[PDB]
Design a protein around this ligand. Structure first.
Ligand SMILES: Nc1ncnc2[nH]cnc12
Ligand SMILES: Nc1ncnc2[nH]cnc12
Lengths: 216, 217
DNA sequence: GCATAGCTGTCAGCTATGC
DNA sequence: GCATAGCTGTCAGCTATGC
């Protein structure tokens, strides 16, 4: 339900904010950890406190093994209009050429504590995270966690967009039935997203490199 | 696909070990955490390293709004056949009455590091875990993680049984097509399992308490 | 014989459905 | 208008289905 278009010299994306179990989830990110939000029941703050509210998007890039879906389309569209240039892609390919390690290589561990809870010993499951933040507010998270349907752990890439960066302003009120917000995607966000996939896993890198070399 | 029966003075559970996406999964311990295992492709060690392979079972207790399913049935049969006494249940109910805090009350946090990865800053997501290990080999884990289909995080209770405690011994070979192992359940495992739910969350406690009370009558 | 479709943890928000 | 059924992140192991 993510619609990517090109309006007024900008790559525009329209995101649904009422599907808490989709790949596009509204979360209140405080203390670093994302917490679910009932957009249809809880009215958003009207203060400057709207900065704590992000849109967690596990962005796609492949469909029918063709690489013309969401991120891949955004990149293609950006390339078509001369926003993303040859040198921009050449940088990314040069960047991927030097990548030897990935987040997926990092391991999950269970650490012990001296705390107890009614006879039970307290431990901590520790999952590795790679994260880059953009000055405009958006940040990109690469999180190692279990696959939703498959077996094992993968690097998950999330694009997190603060609600202060989208329109209309959700401040002071509640999300409407099937409400969709509009978001102008900066080109720098795409490059860092591509970098994020490149360092996520060797498999992701090979896909991105293949895709980028196909449009040079 | 988890059958529970009473045989020869013991509670016996038969577990399928070729469904790695079910609530019964075979995992190999590694740095404290479990790693998935393709039982149909892996020749289990004939060595003494088989004690590092366990059966992760996200055990159930409710169905159709009635508590006669897996764990709940196990408890009923144990009490009916005089393996779980009234004093055992009082001891558990008294224990539940003294619980004011739960694992679900603990918080998830994202810690920072001084480590990087090609410009990206490395962080660590830390989820709380409550664990209890029986001297027999089995251990029980209570893990705060996201719900599979629902929204948000909740306490997950897993029963971890080492393969060295079940029959037959899979040492040396790979698993068979739809192979099922047999495991006799200790009372202490049943008792500590109930405590786990009791401290997992306030909702689980009310379930266990209502269940145990219905048994006495 | 051989390739793969199609199912696959104890659960909550939202809305199309059915009336 | 209202109560609720039934859908719901980018993916792998296993085995019955298809041929
Ligand atoms: N094993 C389990 N883990 C988490 N929640 C549960 N509810 C019932 N059984 C459970
Ligand atoms: N956003 C994403 N996160 C993880 N894996 C992916 N594969 C394709 N898109 C992905």
């Amino acid at each position: 339900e993510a619609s990517v278009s090109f309006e007024n010299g900008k790559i525009v994306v329209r995101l649904p904010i009422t599907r808490p179990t989709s790949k596009i989830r509204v979360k209140k990110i405080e203390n670093g950890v994302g917490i679910p939000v009932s957009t249809r029941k809880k009215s958003f703050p009207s203060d400057e406190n709207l900065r704590d509210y992000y849109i967690e998007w596990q962005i796609s890039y492949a469909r029918d093994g063709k690489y013309d879906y969401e991120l891949s389309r955004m990149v293609r569209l950006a390339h078509e209009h001369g926003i993303l240039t040859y040198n921009d892609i050449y940088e990314l390919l040069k960047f991927a050429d030097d990548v030897k390690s990935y987040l997926e290589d990092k391991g999950i561990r269970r650490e012990s504590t001296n705390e107890e809870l009614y006879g039970f010993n307290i431990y901590e499951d520790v999952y590795p995270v790679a994260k880059k933040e953009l000055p405009s507010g958006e940040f990109i998270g690469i999180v190692l966690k279990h696959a939703q349907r498959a077996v094992g752990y993968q690097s998950m890439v999330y694009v997190c967009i603060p609600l202060t960066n989208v329109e209309p302003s959700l401040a002071g009120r509640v999300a409407r039935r099937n409400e969709v917000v509009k978001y102008e995607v900066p080109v720098d966000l795409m490059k860092e997203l591509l970098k994020a996939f490149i360092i996520a896993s060797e498999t992701h890198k090979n896909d991105i490199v293949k895709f980028l070399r196909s449009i040079i």
